[PDB]
Design a protein around this ligand. Structure first.
Ligand code: LSA
Ligand code: LSA
Ligand code: HG
Ligand code: ZN
Length: 256
């Protein structure tokens, strides 16, 4: 049932998922003046050279580009992370207007969209067990702004036509996630959660400072996706973002 509508949106999620009012929920606002530079942070390492994409799926909430995570290929490590985290999927959250769409905010600024690259900690064997641990997941968050087009995003954009409605999927091999990254790997990091039900508090968040630019046209095609299933009345897939949540007893560290 959960969604982003008036009757099933983020303000309703606590009823089925009481952790929504928890101690380390995501996303959060990033107060750049309060974040502290942490010399203890080691160099971040994003190694997506051997990434193997498999499929793209419309799950009724976003679209997921899924990877083969059966062995050590696309992995995130270093920075605040202990050990190696394996890429399982990526997805976006975006708005109905360029003025909104991101989940994390920076000094209350909302970007047009936000990319989440999801990885699980290989010490726990698989995703499922990973989401039972306080350090089971690492998510690399990247902001999207509207300006020039992102060439590495365009294969994603052109397949969306084929997964318009909930439950549809298409083959999506040989997609290179390195084309979605910005030049800089400066980031903010804090302990947090999934931004969607079940909102599990297992995530080390790594939010890149430098946004990637995407074209109006590319994000506009995102907004053509549907929340509903085929043959059902059209509910455009937009504003699938959760607003910022109480920082509570947490500190945000800067790698720069
Ligand atoms: O996320 C959603 N799921 S839904 O199709 O019930 C819906 C309707 C309107 C706005 C958002 C949403
Ligand atoms: O939608 C979500 N945004 S997130 O990156 O926190 C995440 C992690 C795992 C599964 C789903 C999702
Ligand atoms: Hg957890
Ligand atoms: Zn997400």
């Amino acid at each position: 049932h959960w969604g982003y509508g008036k009757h099933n949106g983020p303000e309703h999620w606590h009823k089925d998922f009481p952790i929504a009012k928890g101690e380390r929920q995501s996303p959060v606002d990033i107060d750049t003046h309060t974040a502290k530079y942490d010399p203890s942070l080691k160099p971040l390492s994003v190694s997506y050279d051997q990434a193997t994409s498999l499929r793209i799926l419309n799950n009724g909430h976003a679209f997921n580009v899924e990877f083969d995570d059966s062995q050590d290929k696309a992995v995130l490590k270093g920075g605040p992370l202990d050990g190696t985290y394996r890429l399982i999927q990526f997805h976006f959250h975006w708005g109905s207007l360029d003025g909104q769409g991101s989940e994390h905010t920076v000094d209350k600024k909302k970007y047009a969209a936000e990319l989440h690259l999801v990885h699980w900690n290989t010490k726990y064997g698989d995703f499922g067990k990973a989401v039972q641990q306080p350090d089971g997941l690492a998510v690399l968050g990247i902001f999207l702004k509207v300006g020039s087009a992102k060439p590495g995003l365009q294969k994603v954009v052109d397949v969306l036509d084929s997964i318009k409605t909930k439950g549809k999927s298409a083959d999506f091999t040989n997609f290179d996630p390195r084309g979605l990254l910005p030049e800089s790997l400066d980031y903010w990091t804090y302990p947090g959660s999934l931004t969607t039900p079940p909102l599990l508090e297992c995530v080390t968040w790594i939010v890149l400072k430098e946004p990637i630019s995407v074209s109006s046209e590319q994000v506009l095609k995102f907004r053509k996706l549907n929340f509903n299933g085929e043959g059902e009345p059209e509910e455009l897939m937009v504003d699938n973002w959760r607003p910022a949540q109480p920082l509570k007893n947490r500190q945000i560290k800067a790698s720069f």
